[PDB]
């Protein structure tokens, strides 16, 4: 609705990561964060070495379980990428997925990047 620019509200969760502060602080986004961003590059690794392989239930599984738990640091932009890719059977993902997984590395890292600077800003007002 006339926001032409979501960068800041639809790659992560704007009032989630507010309170997520306003309980343990960046203590918890920071430190959840930091186990993502270090399992992010590795996870994706797997995800295409399984896609040659046909591992289709495997792929869905490690995509609700990644994108879901970086979705807790405020990364909803994966959260929801996952929770797609959650229903392999549509006539159409078969032929998007490709797209997807491109686009989700491309991309994850800056929903994350985002968040962690709005905690470092929403500190003030």
Same mark, same amino acid.
């Given at each position: 609705?006339?926001?032409?620019?979501?960068?800041?509200?639809?790659?992560?969760?704007?009032?989630?990561?507010?309170?997520?502060?306003?309980?343990?602080?960046? /203590?918890?986004?920071?430190?959840?964060? %930091?186990?993502?961003?270090?399992?992010?590059?590795?996870?994706?690794?797997?995800?295409?070495?399984?896609?040659?392989? #046909?591992? /289709? /239930?495997?792929?869905?599984? !490690?995509?609700?379980?990644?994108?879901? %738990?970086?979705?807790?640091?405020?990364?909803?932009?994966?959260? #929801?990428?996952? #929770?797609?890719?959650?229903?392999?059977?549509?006539? %159409?993902?078969?032929?998007?997925?490709?797209?997807?997984? !491109?686009?989700?590395?491309?991309?994850?890292?800056?929903?994350?990047?985002?968040?962690?600077?709005?905690?470092?800003? %929403?500190?003030?007002?």
């Amino acid at each position: 609705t006339t926001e032409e620019n979501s960068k800041s509200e639809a790659l992560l969760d704007i009032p989630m990561l507010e309170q997520y502060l306003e309980l343990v602080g960046p /203590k918890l986004i920071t430190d959840g964060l %930091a186990v993502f961003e270090k399992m992010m590059p590795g996870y994706v690794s797997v995800l295409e070495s399984n896609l040659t392989a #046909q591992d /289709k /239930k495997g792929i869905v599984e !490690e995509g609700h379980k990644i994108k879901g %738990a970086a979705g807790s640091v405020g990364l909803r932009h994966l959260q #929801q990428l996952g #929770q797609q890719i959650q229903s392999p059977d549509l006539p %159409a993902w078969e032929d998007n997925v490709g797209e997807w997984i !491109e686009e989700m590395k491309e991309e994850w890292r800056h929903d994350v990047e985002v968040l962690k600077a709005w905690v470092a800003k %929403a500190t003030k007002k």
